[PDB]
């Protein structure tokens, strides 16, 4: 429907859902730190030392809850305006091209969202 060209790969523009938050923390795993730190420059709304308190507050569940709620931090700011574009810009730093499209569930022989 509404996609933009990113890293030479097609990607739909919209607010990430619970799937993206869960799949993210379950996909980045260790990169959860990098994506969060890369998003600091990309999004001034998350530039703050959020990752510091995020890791300590989400240190109970581990990288799972750490990155799970990390994706919601951006949606909490605006949610309506907050688009995958910002998240993708953070992955573009660590060279997570496949992770950016796969995040939305583009690893299927069809797709996911619509």
Swiss-Prot record:
Residues 24-91 are annotated as: Interaction with KRT14 and KRT18. The keyword Manganese does not apply. (Microbial infection) Glycosylated at Arg-37 by enteropathogenic E.coli protein NleB1, C.rodentium protein NleB and S.typhimurium proteins Ssek1 and Ssek3: arginine GlcNAcylation prevents homotypic/heterotypic death domain interactions and assembly of the oligomeric TNFRSF1A/TNFR1 complex, thereby disrupting TNF signaling. Keywords: Apoptosis, Cytoplasm, Cytoskeleton, Glycoprotein, Nucleus. A motif (Nuclear localization signal) lies at residues 33-46. Found in all examined tissues. One of its GO terms (cellular component) is tumor necrosis factor receptor superfamily complex. GO terms for molecular function: death domain binding; identical protein binding; kinase binding; protein-macromolecule adaptor activity; signaling adaptor activity; transmembrane receptor protein tyrosine kinase adaptor activity. Glycans are attached at residues 37, 47. Changing residue 47 to A: Strongly reduced GlcNAcylation by S.typhimurium Ssek1. Residues 1-91 form the Death domain. It is found in: Nucleus; Cytoplasm; Cytoplasm, Cytoskeleton. GO terms for biological process: apoptotic process; canonical NF-kappaB signal transduction; cellular response to tumor necrosis factor; extrinsic apoptotic signaling pathway; extrinsic apoptotic signaling pathway via death domain receptors; positive regulation of apoptotic process; positive regulation of canonical NF-kappaB signal transduction; positive regulation of cell migration. Stimulation of TNF-alpha receptor TNFRSF1A leads to the formation of two distinct signaling complexes. Plasma membrane-bound complex I is composed of TNFRSF1A, TRADD, RIPK1, TRAF2 and BIRC2/c-IAP1 or BIRC3 which interacts with CHUCK/IKK-alpha, IKBKB/IKK-beta and IKBKG/IKK-gamma promoting cell survival. Subsequently, TRADD, RIPK1 and TRAF2 dissociate from TNFRSF1A and form cytoplasmic complex II with FADD and caspase CASP8 promoting cell apoptosis. Within complex I, interacts with TNFRSF1A/TNFR1, TRAF2 and kinase RIPK1. Adapter molecule for TNFRSF1A/TNFR1 that specifically associates with the cytoplasmic domain of activated TNFRSF1A/TNFR1 mediating its interaction with FADD. Overexpression of TRADD leads to two major TNF-induced responses, apoptosis and activation of NF-kappa-B. The nuclear form acts as a tumor suppressor by preventing ubiquitination and degradation of isoform p19ARF/ARF of CDKN2A by TRIP12: acts by interacting with TRIP12, leading to disrupt interaction between TRIP12 and isoform p19ARF/ARF of CDKN2A. Requires the intact death domain to associate with TNFRSF1A/TNFR1. This is Tumor necrosis factor receptor type 1-associated DEATH domain protein. The chain holds residues 199 to 312 of 312 of the full protein.
